[PDB]
Nucleic acid binder design. Structure first.
Lengths: 131, 241, 33, 123
RNA sequence: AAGCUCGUAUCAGUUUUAUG
RNA sequence: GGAAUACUGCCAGCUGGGACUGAGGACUGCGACGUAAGUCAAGGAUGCUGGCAUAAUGGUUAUAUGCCGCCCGUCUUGAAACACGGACCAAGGAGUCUAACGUCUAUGCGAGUGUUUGGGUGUAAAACCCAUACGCGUAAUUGAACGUAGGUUGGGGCCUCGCAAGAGGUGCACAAUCGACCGAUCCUGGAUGGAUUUGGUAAGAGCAUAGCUGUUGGGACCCGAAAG
RNA sequence: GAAAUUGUUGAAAGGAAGGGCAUUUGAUCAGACAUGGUGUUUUGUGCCCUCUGCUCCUUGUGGGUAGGGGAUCUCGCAU
């Protein structure tokens, strides 16, 4: 089992350090899933398009359930009515960031999401397709 | 002015005090529970000793009555046999090696308790040249459990030195003391398999007085060391222990 | 940190089995039938 | 401190390091399959292995009980003020005798043990 | 070597019963 | 008739002698002694004594003593063996570079990506920017929104119920089933209605650079042969 | 100015030598300018008591530096 991040980015190392403590001291499996995903390689972390988030936000009660992505969020011109919601991801593209902000939503980092939801209440983790 | 304490320090102190106010009460609760558990263990041990004494006295009385009555008394077949590995890993044939592995006999001078059953009899017959077995007594089982009894805490090997260790793992089945484990080992209860698997395979040293016979690799009935040594298995285990 | 061996060092033996005191009260082993 | 148990005091020597002059004493593992040393037959030179590992609590500690620490100048020497008992100041071989006396004076002032005092000096 | 699920009912150079 | 003794086994019975071991490093716990204070052999040696600065001890090497050890590397082969080379020493000596095609890892951007063929600039082969084109992908069995650009069943995860076991609600990727347009089988007669499987949309996931690593051609890990 | 190699002095050992485990003997090398720490008793000093000043910031639970008066003095040092 992958136990350390191969990425040399110090910020990702700090995120891993925080998430390990959160998972070990909280016991909530939500932190464990994010910590495990943080070790996934770039090929194993496909981007999640804003269209994917918008279509996944049709889930019941998803308006108040902040969506979480462990990879990168990319813009999508195929849609024009992105729901007003908060999205948390490591990196947000300029187009995706503008679309999310313009729609009245907000974009936050993983640490901000963890502080807001230490136990992961109402969280929704999305994973990009591999096929 | 008086330097005020840091707000973070104040919160930390308040949290520590709140946690200690519960830890202190939990300590007293644990002490009371330990006292009650010790009393229960004492009464259970007394009951087990009484049961063993009554059983042996009844067996002896039945034998004497049968002798006096001019009849034959068929003693109950032993339902528990201990097995010890006598041969090394080298050159062991494949099927006997697999049988020994299934019996947790991974090294020489190691043994475990095996329930006597119709199926296990054939398994024992299949590994006679490599293992010596017999019917252990209460004293031998108690000595083994006390001296080389190790508990398996879900992945590992832990020495059995406290009833709390047994209770934390075997307490699910009502076993809360070393005496309870010994009773469940000598008597094949419903939870015999769980107790047997919980105990780590015994690591026994070579006999203090030697194996006696000049050659070990022979049947015990012909001056050897393996095979059925029902009565002498206790002596062999005690010498090895 | 160190495994105390029962059957000796009576102090540890009593911890494992509180009935050992009652056993030693009459020695529980020379009972006459 | 814990006893300094040296698992192997004898210096390891390469096979045939003395039979032929072209073979350096520096240890080198035999690569040939037929080599007896590689098979560690009885009576052959001992082969270094993980077993001879020294314990951490006594690793790198000299018999005097102080760890060696190379010192180049007074600035380096002053760093051992808080670790005099555990560390000892060792003067480098390239230090001129002019600075050696000054370094020794500071070591004595701070009480830092010197592994090789009086080197290049005369009384 | 790396990704999914599952630590579960997944198996066994082991044995016995039933289908000859 | 009755003692015993002989033999097997038990003692959570008692009592010595001999050898090694002293590991952890302020208290957290299981236990015993005692009405309590306190003590203890109870999760690892405590105290005393004896030798010492012309020290005590330890270290390097020659021989010697009890025992062991066929001469080094390569290839034959299933083996041991033959054999191939080795008089000795200082220096020299060998999977290195390049072009294409890939996996994995890391970085930047991201449906965009690649400044450096060049132009501007310049403390000048240094350093810093990009107007126009260009390679890649961004969609094709003509064209894919009617719907999570899909119903149902599982599915990391989240929420309510609950002290737990567990119940209910909601579900990314992924898997099974069945789904929508639009074309070929193969009918039907240039269509029409469709037989039963068909390959896309399904929902972008890609572009640039750094590292190990694989294949091919270049001298290709190094040395060497009849020839033209 | 090192080896292969060669000659002398010394030690050792003698149809061979070479290496490993443990040790005696012979030769020989290291083996603290460590000379302390604690409480008490005289005396002289200062950064020590008191009076009078100057100077840096900011402003602060400070720093630096002067001129008059003594051994209430162990606050440190030296005896």
């Amino acid at each position: 089992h992958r136990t350390a991040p191969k990425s040399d980015n110090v910020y990702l190392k700090l995120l891993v350090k925080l998430y390990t403590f959160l998972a070990r001291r909280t016991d909530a499996p939500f932190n464990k899933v994010v910590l495990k995903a943080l070790f996934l390689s770039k090929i194993n972390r496909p981007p999640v398009s804003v269209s994917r988030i918008a279509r996944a936000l049709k889930q019941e009660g998803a308006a108040n359930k902040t969506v979480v992505v462990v990879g990168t969020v990319t813009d999508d011109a195929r849609i024009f009515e992105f729901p007003k919601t908060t999205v948390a991801a490591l990196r947000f593209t300029a187009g995706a960031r503008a679309k999310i902000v313009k729609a009245g939503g907000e974009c936050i980092t993983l640490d901000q999401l963890a502080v807001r939801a230490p136990k992961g209440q109402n969280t929704l983790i999305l994973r990009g397709p591999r096929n | 002015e008086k330097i005020l304490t840091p707000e973070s320090q104040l919160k930390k102190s308040k949290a520590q005090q709140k946690t200690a106010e519960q830890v202190a009460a939990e300590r007293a609760a644990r002490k009371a529970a330990n006292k009650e558990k010790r009393a229960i263990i004492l009464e259970r041990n007394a009951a087990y000793q009484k049961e063993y004494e009554t059983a042996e006295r009844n067996i002896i009385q039945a034998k004497r009555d049968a002798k006096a009555a001019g009849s034959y008394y068929v003693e109950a077949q032993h339902k528990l046999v201990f097995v010890v590995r006598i041969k090394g890993i080298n050159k062991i044939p494949p099927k006997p090696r697999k049988v020994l592995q299934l019996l947790r006999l991974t090294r020489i001078n190691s043994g475990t308790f095996v329930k006597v059953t119709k199926a296990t009899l054939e398994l024992l017959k299949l590994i006679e040249p490599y293992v010596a077995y017999g019917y252990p007594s209460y004293s031998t089982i108690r000595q083994l459990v006390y001296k080389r009894g190790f508990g398996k805490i879900n992945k590992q090997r832990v020495p059995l030195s406290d009833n709390a260790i047994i209770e934390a793992n075997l307490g699910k089945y009502g076993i809360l003391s070393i005496d309870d484990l010994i009773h469940e080992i000598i008597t094949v209860g419903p939870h015999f398999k769980q107790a047997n698997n919980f105990l780590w395979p015994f690591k026994l040293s070579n006999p203090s007085g030697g194996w006696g016979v000049p050659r070990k690799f022979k049947h015990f009935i012909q001056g050897g060391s393996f095979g059925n040594r029902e009565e002498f298995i206790n002596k062999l285990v005690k010498s090895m222990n | 940190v160190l495994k105390k061996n029962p059957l000796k060092n009576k102090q540890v033996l009593l911890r494992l089995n509180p009935y050992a005191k009652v056993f030693a009260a009459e020695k529980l082993g020379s009972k006459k039938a | 401190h814990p006893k300094i148990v040296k698992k192997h005091t004898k210096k390891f020597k390469r096979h045939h390091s003395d039979r032929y002059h072209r073979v350096a004493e520096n240890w080198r593992k035999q690569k040939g399959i037929d080599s007896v040393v590689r098979r560690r037959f009885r009576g052959n030179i001992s082969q270094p292995k993980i077993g001879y590992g020294s314990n951490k609590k006594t690793k790198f500690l000299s018999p005097s009980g102080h760890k060696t620490f190379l010192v180049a100048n007074v600035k380096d020497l002053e760093t051992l003020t808080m670790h005099t008992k555990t560390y000892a100041a060792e003067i480098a071989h390239n230090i001129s005798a002019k600075n050696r006396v000054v370094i020794l004076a500071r070591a004595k002032a701070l009480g830092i043990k010197v592994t090789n005092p009086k080197g290049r000096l005369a009384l």
